[PDB]
Scaffold this active site. Sequence first.
Site, PDB file in Angstrom:
ATOM      1  N   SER A   1      -2.852 -12.981   3.555  1.00 33.29           N
ATOM      2  CA  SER A   1      -3.111 -12.845   2.121  1.00 33.29           C
ATOM      3  C   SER A   1      -1.905 -13.295   1.285  1.00 33.29           C
ATOM      4  O   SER A   1      -2.067 -13.689   0.131  1.00 33.29           O
ATOM      5  CB  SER A   1      -3.497 -11.405   1.743  1.00 33.29           C
ATOM      6  OG  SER A   1      -2.423 -10.491   1.898  1.00 33.29           O
TER       7      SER A   1
ATOM      8  N   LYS B   1       0.795  -1.238   0.000  1.00 30.52           N
ATOM      9  CA  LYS B   1       0.000   0.000   0.000  1.00 30.52           C
ATOM     10  C   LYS B   1       0.821   1.279   0.000  1.00 30.52           C
ATOM     11  O   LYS B   1       0.321   2.344  -0.389  1.00 30.52           O
ATOM     12  CB  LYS B   1      -0.959   0.030   1.185  1.00 30.52           C
ATOM     13  CG  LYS B   1      -2.084  -1.005   1.150  1.00 30.52           C
ATOM     14  CD  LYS B   1      -2.875  -0.918  -0.154  1.00 30.52           C
ATOM     15  CE  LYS B   1      -4.168  -1.709  -0.081  1.00 30.52           C
ATOM     16  NZ  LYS B   1      -3.925  -3.075   0.398  1.00 30.52           N
TER      17      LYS B   1
HETATM   18  C1  LIG Z   1      -4.004  -4.050  -0.430  1.00 28.16           C
HETATM   19  C2  LIG Z   1      -3.727  -5.502   0.016  1.00 28.16           C
HETATM   20  C3  LIG Z   1      -3.905  -6.568  -0.868  1.00 28.16           C
HETATM   21  C4  LIG Z   1      -4.525  -6.383  -2.241  1.00 28.16           C
HETATM   22  O1  LIG Z   1      -3.790  -5.498  -3.075  1.00 28.16           O
HETATM   23  P1  LIG Z   1      -4.569  -4.678  -4.204  1.00 28.16           P
HETATM   24  O2  LIG Z   1      -3.551  -3.993  -5.047  1.00 28.16           O
HETATM   25  O3  LIG Z   1      -5.363  -3.576  -3.392  1.00 28.16           O
HETATM   26  O4  LIG Z   1      -5.574  -5.571  -4.844  1.00 28.16           O
HETATM   27  C5  LIG Z   1      -3.653  -7.837  -0.451  1.00 28.16           C
HETATM   28  N1  LIG Z   1      -3.235  -8.082   0.822  1.00 28.16           N
HETATM   29  C6  LIG Z   1      -3.056  -7.063   1.696  1.00 28.16           C
HETATM   30  C7  LIG Z   1      -2.548  -7.368   3.106  1.00 28.16           C
HETATM   31  C8  LIG Z   1      -3.296  -5.762   1.301  1.00 28.16           C
HETATM   32  O5  LIG Z   1      -3.051  -4.723   2.178  1.00 28.16           O
END
Ligand SMILES: *Cc1c(COP(=O)(O)O)cnc(C)c1O
EC number: 2.5.1.47
Lengths: 304, 302
Positions: free
Chosen positions: B272, B41
């Site tokens: 994630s 981010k």
């Molecule tokens: C933002 C984020 C994602 C997804 O990324 P995008 O570019 O917004 O689709 C995945 N995992 C985490 C922990 C995130 O902060």
Amino acid sequence: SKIYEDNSLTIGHTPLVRLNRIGNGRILAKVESRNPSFSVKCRIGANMIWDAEKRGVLKPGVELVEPTNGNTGIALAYVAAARGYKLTLTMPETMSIERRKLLKALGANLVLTEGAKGMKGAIQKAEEIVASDPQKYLLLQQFSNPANPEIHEKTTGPEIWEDTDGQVDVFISGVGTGGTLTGVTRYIKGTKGKTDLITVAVEPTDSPVIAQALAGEEIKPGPHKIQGIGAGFIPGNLDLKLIDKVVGITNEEAISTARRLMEEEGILAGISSGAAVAAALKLQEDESFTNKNIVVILPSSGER
Amino acid sequence: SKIYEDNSLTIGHTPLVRLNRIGNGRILAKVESRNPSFSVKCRIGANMIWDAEKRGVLKPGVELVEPTNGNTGIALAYVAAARGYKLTLTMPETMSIERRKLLKALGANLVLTEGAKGMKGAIQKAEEIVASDPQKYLLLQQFSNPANPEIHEKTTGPEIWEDTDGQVDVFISGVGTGGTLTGVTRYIKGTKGKTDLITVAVEPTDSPVIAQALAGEEIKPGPHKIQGIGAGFIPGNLDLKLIDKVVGITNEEAISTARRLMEEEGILAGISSGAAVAAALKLQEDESFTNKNIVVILPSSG
Ligand SMILES: *Cc1c(COP(=O)(O)O)cnc(C)c1O
Ligand SMILES: *Cc1c(COP(=O)(O)O)cnc(C)c1O
Ligand SMILES: [Cl-]
Ligand SMILES: [Cl-]
């Protein structure tokens, strides 16, 4: 191509950022939290292991034991996991649960020592372990292993030199093992011949053993809050001869400066990072330092 | 020289690391936690701000207003402090207290919004605060501000292309805002012309809205534990047309794979990241993927 064969090879190449609101615009902060495991310790976690492999002492069958559990222990756990070594960490039972969960998640085998005995116990409990089976066990020892200052001489130092195009006038390092201070200085003053570089060691005002040592006084440590620095003695990896000045910082100055780093610069810094930057500010009160470019190591993100 | 003028300029150039035990040796993980604020981010926190400055809407004295329930607000806080901007974050009351405490500690002015309305209510409130005084406030909306996928098209994508010398065959991205998937894919399939790159979107099995949307079905989200992805709707920054395959991951698969990353690779990964790598493992169960170089985004640390 630029594909790292394992996470240990990704160490270093940390950014040098100009502080704009803290100091006179000439404090350049090296962000060591931009490393695997979030601290400068990843460089030595990696090199002490690579060095042991090169020396033929670390190999299939040999396993690691370390009293460490702070930033070095975490660094050793990630490298061990990435390179396939069993690792046993001894640590006073006082450590936070998340801290041990993290180490265990990394696959480390944890051995808790008597809380009251503190780190002195874990240190004993680790040498006990290796002594028990000297061939099966390898104790690295960050305080005296040369591979510690060596990695800073081969990476941290060159990075500082190249990023400033040789325009570094003062180098400030809070001392823990002393390897960063020693290795970077050997590279810049030695290898690059910039003998007029001013190397500044930073330590807690409440446990000023480097200032004591340099003054020929008796070594008398004390308790302090600047995690990561001020071990209470002179490490084998700290070459006192390379030190031009020692700055003592209070727990309060360290903490308040670390907070300024986040609020005024958007840099998430640990307490020792606040201490090192506080030292830069103190030097800038002296007119001889006013137009010098000061490079300061920010060792870790903290813990928070 | 290489002196960064402020911490926001240090984003990107994250390492691509070969996974040696997880998978067949062809899974290359891009470690986005090697960024300020420890997540992908920071790239968008920085570019949305840089973009607003370039457009002339962001100027000294202008306060930022952004809806958030996760990593974007955190990154925006770092970037805002670095470039000297005050920041207000709207977030739904569903947000945990620790999360609120952390964000305030980072210097943001917190505005809690109706729990029942979720993220939609937080973006709604952000717009209202802006409209309340548009010269004072600038909205930075990560789900629709094209500066989000733009930064990925300009940094993440090129990094993947140069680091693999163009040898990337599959690109896996767990979708939150969808900006990473969109920008990287535009760079590689578009600018570089590699049309047979296989772009894979990853989402939670319990809230498969991308599969639903691509199947022409009604969007029906659900609760899940893969923090950072699965917003429960189709973000304006997710170009559905660029997706070749969608892989649904369970909470258990995401968590256990994140644990494998730490223990078998020494990579500190968030849930994630485990989800994205679990998707790579699933693809390698298919013979058609056996010899392909798979680049997977690991969004953040544990
Ligand atoms: C933002 C984020 C994602 C997804 O990324 P995008 O570019 O917004 O689709 C995945 N995992 C985490 C922990 C995130 O902060
Ligand atoms: C190790 C460390 C230091 C000191 O670095 P040395 O190279 O060992 O002198 C400072 N702060 C923190 C948080 C550390 O972990
Ligand atoms: Cl930072
Ligand atoms: Cl990592």
